[PDB]
Symmetry: C4
Amino acid sequence: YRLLRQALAECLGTLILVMFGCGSVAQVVLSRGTHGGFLTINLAFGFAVTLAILVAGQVSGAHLNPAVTFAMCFLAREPWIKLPIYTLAQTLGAFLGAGIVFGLYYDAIWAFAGNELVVSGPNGTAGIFATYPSGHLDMVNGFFDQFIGTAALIVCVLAIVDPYNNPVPRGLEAFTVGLVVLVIGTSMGFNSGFAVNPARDFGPRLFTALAGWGSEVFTTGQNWWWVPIVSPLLGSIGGVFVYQLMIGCHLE
Amino acid sequence: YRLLRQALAECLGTLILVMFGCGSVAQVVLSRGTHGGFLTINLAFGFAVTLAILVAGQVSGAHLNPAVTFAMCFLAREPWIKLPIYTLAQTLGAFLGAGIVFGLYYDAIWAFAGNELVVSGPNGTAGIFATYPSGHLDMVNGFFDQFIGTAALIVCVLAIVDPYNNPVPRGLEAFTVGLVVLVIGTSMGFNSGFAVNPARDFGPRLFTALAGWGSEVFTTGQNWWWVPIVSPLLGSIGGVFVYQLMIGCHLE
Amino acid sequence: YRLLRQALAECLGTLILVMFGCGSVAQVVLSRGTHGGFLTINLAFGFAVTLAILVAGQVSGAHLNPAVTFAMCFLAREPWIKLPIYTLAQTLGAFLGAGIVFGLYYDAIWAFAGNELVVSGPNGTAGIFATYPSGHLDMVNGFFDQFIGTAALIVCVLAIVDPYNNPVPRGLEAFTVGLVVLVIGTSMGFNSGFAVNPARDFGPRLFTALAGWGSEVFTTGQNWWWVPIVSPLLGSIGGVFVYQLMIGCHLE
Amino acid sequence: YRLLRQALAECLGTLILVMFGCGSVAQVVLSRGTHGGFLTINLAFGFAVTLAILVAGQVSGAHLNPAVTFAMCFLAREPWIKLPIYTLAQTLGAFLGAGIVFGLYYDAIWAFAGNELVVSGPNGTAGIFATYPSGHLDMVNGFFDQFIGTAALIVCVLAIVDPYNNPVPRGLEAFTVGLVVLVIGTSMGFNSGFAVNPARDFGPRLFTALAGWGSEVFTTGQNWWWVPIVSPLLGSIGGVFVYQLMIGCHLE
């Protein structure tokens, strides 16, 4: 089955970027102001996308993003049957990647607040895997951060993918997408990294619910859990319209 | 219309680098010494140029700089009709990119000084979008910073563009220009990023005048607003003469 | 002898990355919080692998890692006779590279604790060349760090090496492997750099035993010296199985 | 004259890297602990070499280093007549590049110690352009830093240049050399950047003698001025022998 081989590549690809991305976030969170800052978090997340694409690019096209997968299906470039398979394959692997990060820092995570698992607060460890609203990053303000961030990601992704452009060889397509992830994190008000990925958010968040953080990861921040899922999906639609209206529709 | 399609690519390209570049500047300015320093500002601005060129390189040549556009027209490589169209397309998109950054940090910008918009000072938010003279960066000292900075940018741009050189494939022409932007910011005494772009300066500055900062953005620093426009234009002329006298005129 | 020429390339390649990698570690350790942090250590180690591969890639394939060499021999891609020759050639050169770093910082290393050589502690200089357990990086916790780290390295290495993929040209195979080394150090809880290399660990550690640190470098941390040797070897086996089960076995 | 065109490319190439490299050093020195650290100095110097090579690579081969030029002449790859012409062309342009940096920071340099120019000390500004011995970087210790640093630079340069290797296309030869410069600065105990270049050292040092710092720049540190000239020259000879004995002589 061709679809099965593409799904396994998406599972391994999302496993690489989540394990590498959330692993660097664990170092900064657990070692408060000692192992680096936000620059290392975005550099690790940005470079992890480059490595993840190179691993699974030749098999499944290296989407590693349900918002990106939704964009190609919306543009009639890929069949709609690939969307549920890729999304489950992208979510399963971010769940697995979060488990590896949990195993790596099992003692440090459990010792952050003594012998308890705290979701949000000063000694909060659930923010390593998922994203939670900040002081100026509430639901209203944070919703537009994912919308604009994902729209910019889709525009840059479609620029290097459109067949009407030059056939960029292998290698100069993961560094570019990895550059977009690094710049988006540095530009937007998100300090977790790769916030424009619904699978990178819901996957590890679902793991934290079963890891021992309880159901509070889904009923906190005025039910914020669905925002990093719906908002990037809307941004993919907006990013597609922006690219098509400006560049896409004029390439005869 | 071919010129219309090239103008739309220049508008989207300047939108990407301004929104990404000024977004990182907003993080450092609003979060004083928390989200990074000048290294992240120049890295984001330098990488944003790489992404912006890759998006619009195959359509309009990816100038994204009125000084760069003036250089090609001066060297008789492009028609003079493209200069007013590209400049307006480069300015419109830096205006739009500044509006997106304003929407992203609307609450944080307005809360920097309580409920007021301050142009310059300790709690100054107008410096996120435009550039203003510093203690050692006055009109006399700052004028030569744009002249030398733009001249070095034009020399590096003409080196990878001259047809007498090797036909560099797609991909190794945005990273190089993006490298020049990053090095120029690190070398020159500008902490805003990409100061050698007249569109990146006048565009967001014009937005701040209508955003709520008043007309003080145009009548401050002994009328500094015209310096980051005329000085890079003179640097493009000087950079063209430097490259032609040393390398350009000797390529038979 | 073809095998002799490949061994000499492996010796020089491991010499470059060890001398460059451990040299940056010496700057941070000796200049406590002055010459940079962990970001510079991983950047130097990651970029040193890129330079080392480019130097010896065209001769011996640029393994520079006994775990990587074990993976290719396990996958029947290289003869088993190359494993003992490459491992000795990789160990000899990390021993030589450590001697160069020792000569560079001979006065600073000896003056860290007055006129004595201390293996572990506050004024510990043996950690520049080798790796020692930390507070949360004991034998049990540190063993899985090398296992997961090396498994991720093998998966990324096999992705760009498998003949069934695109023939990536020279240049886009050292930056990718160098990216993996940089990301692994930023993700995993190791602050020394390139901890997934048995030769980079045992080589300089053997040098410190004869340099003047005594035999305490081999009988400290509950005999930790063998962990960064056996654990990456097991990770190479696990990394091979992960890549083959997900991607490798499905490429007809 | 072919030699005249190659000399003009070497003059412009050394002008780019010196002006960009020393400009970042001026920011860190004048703004004490505000504009960055040693990481930005090595990143700017490393990336400046990449830009300088791309500008003058197609004309003069982009040596930009008398030690590198001496290596090719020693290996009988280039005529010996090119050595005096390239060295003068490399020195003239580092002298010019230092003058541009002086003009950029004329007020800040003169105001470091009031209205005086101090060569060495706390308020020392002559270290921006040239290199001076540190506490642990005296003549005996600093001599071996240039020897090992230049030997590693020559080995990496000869690896990507030898015709027996793959014909690396344009673009993947300036980033590699620029990587070597960045790693060498991070590894070695030099905080100025690109210390393995005799032209980058003597050029700006000669400018400081006539700029107003007096003749003390040549009679300080027990006559240290000749060390960053002779020592890299010896390192080029050692680096050539290392590469030839290990890799060079075995490529039939």
